[PDB]
DNA sequence: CTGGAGAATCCCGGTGCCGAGGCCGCTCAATTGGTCGTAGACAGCTCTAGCACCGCTTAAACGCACGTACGCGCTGTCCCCCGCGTTTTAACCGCCAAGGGGATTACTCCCTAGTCTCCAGGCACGTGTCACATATATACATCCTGT
């Protein structure tokens, strides 16, 4: 499938603008896609382990919140 | 309660003053 | 109508090396200090104490931040030291000795 | 029609004397979401 | 009675981490010197 | 009814004291609901471990106070401890 | 014609997007990427429409926070411009390496 | 007749905060004033955060605390930013700040 | 009038002596070997605890223990730990 | 009665299942522990103990020492890719560090 | 007691920096190191004493320091007993 | 000795030993003076002070390993105070 | 520094949509009232450490002196990101009408687990010591750095 290119250069530039970045190197978009795909795969992998254990077929938002709290990255606003 | 930290109480006072100044301009 | 009195003692000790040092020519060690007369913690109301020395030293304006406030140094001659005690409250005028 | 649906905040706030829809055929469904967009137009008269 | 080796479970090779290349040489060298070695075994 | 309980009735009761005329959006109210579930579990887990440290089998108010001391930055801890101790003092007299 | 100097529209983008709290990754492409990543963990796993929202919020926050630490490494080398060298130092210090 | 919470001069739930304590396998004995203390502390943090966020939003010409200003109130406070250091408030964006080096002139 | 304190030293030397017959272990290294065991025990039990509580459950189980080992240990570390435990539960329920 | 068999023995473990389950029974980690949790937990605990004792002893032998010191633990848990991850936020007393000298700070 | 942050000498810092891969050290970095170390020490010591005052004890045991380090994300092995 | 030759030797030597690098007696008074501000007359187990030292030397060695990477960032060999500050800020200690 | 254009911001006032709060009505759950073991607290008391001192020894910290090596600075060179206009892909409807996959929920029931006994090996703390390797010693090997 290979749809890691949905996170496009304009999107990475918007995320950099929000983060204060005011100039971005050319090879910063092929870096950020590898950095984001490792972070996603880690939080999804833990959300699918909290979903298999509950004998459920749909990854609910609670699974994502629990798996995100496992990494330390704590997000407020989705029932946890 | 109205027994907050002194810096927080001062921030509330400063916010009232900021609102009053903003309205003093806008009005 | 509130008057608070805090007793303190400020001074200096000195020890003679027995001979003039060849490195810098100094003949005495000395420690200049402010300490309380009572057994009390000055840090509860003293922010810092600044000691201004004679202009022969690389930096004359020394600082100390915990009681018993003191500085240890070496020298060969006598000079007047200005001790400026600052209080925690910035509205209170520091004391000069 | 198709660039009134994503530009409707601007049109609703106007006193239209006549609101005219050509080939009104395009407005078959009540649950259309452009039926709602056109319905919430202040218009004294309507012509299909 | 029991199979009586799960208690010691010596190798348990889920983490085996093969020894190779220069290590082979070391072994070879060792064997050579052992064949060249002396009374004490 | 029951199903899903939450903090919403206390995040809005306490908000009507600090700012009588300020409201709160459903999303922001949800965020406050979530935030309280964070601190509750943090303080209670550190208090359970504290009970486990001095080998008590009970979480008393002393354990909770020491757990509050371990998490709040100074002024925050110094005012939270006062809040808790005043509440416990006033609840023991009634 | 008229065009802004390099750095004028940049600070305007900075100001616009560092004031308006909304998502910056296109919704549908990120939802497709989530399914791609989850395909290699458990085949045919449905994602609730709000689970991907939580994933996207927690990913945009992570990337914004990683760009704020990268922009510091860029300025550490006297570089107003950020590049893979600054992200790498920032993530090195964060303990993400 | 009188909720245990009311008998502290509080707005928060001393009663349910007791149940959450002695149901979550924290210990084996929740004292009389363990929930009375924890509820007080929770209500205190709520008061602080709610006030800050509320008139941060009212600083924005708003009469409804929005999560953007929840984030602003939390991120501007030096104590609440230490407490909620590793917490990402959703739909709260970031704080406005431009590094001097980037800024022109 | 004794004050005896427990530790894992007796079973870390069984396992070490078995997985390194010629190698000893210093007392200071056995302290680290003890702290490591207690730390991982805490981690796995806590994650199983949370696992059970998330599904509204009053009992921490070996199924929750396996899922906590899947969450805790990295990929290989996990695989080996899960396999070892899984095979230890079928050797125990077969009345060997 | 019957000759009593332990729980480490029936399963085939070295780490005390009785003691492990015991810390759990009066550890409030849960409310009603089952009959497999301590077995799994002890099995994996001791598995990691073995996993590390391995690398520690091997590095020790690299140092021509027969006794594992905490150094043989720092060096190991930092030498293995996944033990380091698992014990990334763990400092081993009297272990030291690994001699990672930056390439750019060398003689040129 | 007084003026004990000075008990961390210039060689004492230089050796620690040598173990960390640092080759050449600057002049002011010694004071920066002193400040950083002072802050870290004060936090750990405060948290440890939190376990002593609550325990009504007068001596800070090792377990208190171990737990204080754990709360700081600095799990230490070797003092667990 | 060519500046940097006796210093690299020490890097290779202090990265191979495991003994503490701060003197004991001087560091134990610092741990008691810091305790001063929390409780008059606090006692310390000897092993407790040793554990404090084992915490701090590891923390400082990690901070001097993360500070060196920042020095190498600006094409420097010297670690500068802003390097400790950048490492620590990226650490979240003084953000 | 002023000019003068040309774009961006930036509050004022306006206009509807829809979330935020308003109330109502029962379900869950916190209160009340009371008996029943007991958590831990507090009053001794054993007995380790902790602390505090003092001496002798010497590593080590430290100050100084002296080049060398490395650090902010300048400038020039060249390219690679910024700004912005055009071509292309993504992505919404309307058009098309509902099955079904799966969380949500209970009611039985049998199996697992607490509770609570009485035994019996096995884990701790001694004791009895044996011995890795720390410290010491020397030549061999790099491993420099000044010529």
Author numbering:
A (entry chain H): 23 to 102
B (entry chain J): 130 to 156
C (entry chain W): 18 to 114
D (entry chain I): 725 to 772
E (entry chain L): 1 to 41
F (entry chain F): 28 to 121
G (entry chain G): 38 to 134
H (entry chain E): 14 to 118
What text comes from the article?
The ATP-dependent chromatin remodeler SRCAP complex (SRCAP-C) promotes the replacement of canonical histone H2A–H2B dimer with H2A.Z–H2B dimer. Here, we determined structures of human SRCAP-C bound to H2A-containing nucleosome at near-atomic resolution. SRCAP-C can be divided into motor and ARP modules, which merge at the ATPase of the SRCAP subunit. As a scaffold, the SRCAP subunit consists of an N-terminal helicase-SANT-associated (HSA) and pre-HSA helices that integrate the ARP module, an ATPase domain grasping the nucleosomal DNA, and an insert threading through the RUVBL1–RUVBL2 hexamer.
ADP-BeFx is a structural analog of the pre-ATP hydrolysis nucleotide, where BeFx mimics γ-phosphoryl group in the ground state. Cryo-EM map of the complex in the ADP-BeFx-bound state reveals a compact fold with approximate dimensions of ~170 Å × 170 Å × 200 Å. The cryo-EM map in the ADP-BeFx-bound conformation shows that ADP, but not ADP-BeFx, is present in RUVBL1 and RUVBL2, consistent with the remaining low ATPase activity of the ATPase-dead mutant of SRCAP-C. The ATPase in the ADP-BeFx-bound state adopts a fold similar to those in previously reported structures of yeast SWR-C and Snf2. Two lobes of the ATPase together grasp nucleosomal DNA at SHL 2. At interface-3, we observed cryo-EM density packing against the acidic patch of the motor-proximal H2A–H2B dimer. The density is in close proximity to the modeled N-terminus (residue V18) of ZNHIT1, suggesting that the density is derived from the N-terminal region of ZNHIT1 (residues 1–17). Consistently, this region is rich in positively charged residues (K4/K5/R9/R16/R17), possibly generating charge–charge interactions with the acidic patch of H2A–H2B. In the ADP-BeFx-bound state, the C-terminal tail of histone H2A (residues 110–119) interacts with the αN helix of H3, and the C-terminal basic residues are positioned near the entry DNA. The contacts between the basic residues of the N-terminal region of ZNHIT1 and the H2A–H2B acidic patch in the ADP-BeFx-bound state suggest a key role of these residues in H2A-H2A.Z exchange.
